[PDB]
Amino acid sequence: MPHAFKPGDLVFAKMKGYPHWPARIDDIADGAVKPPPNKYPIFFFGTHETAFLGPKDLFPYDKSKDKYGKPNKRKGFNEGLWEIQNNPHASYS
């Protein structure tokens, strides 16, 4: 059965107005800003943006890739697909 989300989990993350987007659950570094309660820090591949999202917007990558893992014209998306497939745990700083 599934566990709660944890840092390093890979997902497609959904934001109003954007296609389901390759992303990961990030860690929070020592001394770094924490997310609000019930929210996770989501690192979006390709754009390298962070937003705070709850589970309703997080789709596990293995289950969802056949549906959501296809090229999109949006800035940074295809770069994102390469990152999530080829080096999802690297430093993108």
Ligand SMILES: CN(CC(=O)N1CCCCC1)S(C)(=O)=O
């Ligand atoms: C987090 N993204 C949306 C977003 O806030 N923005 C898009 C990038 C420029 C700033 C505004 S995403 C899903 O990576 O496209």
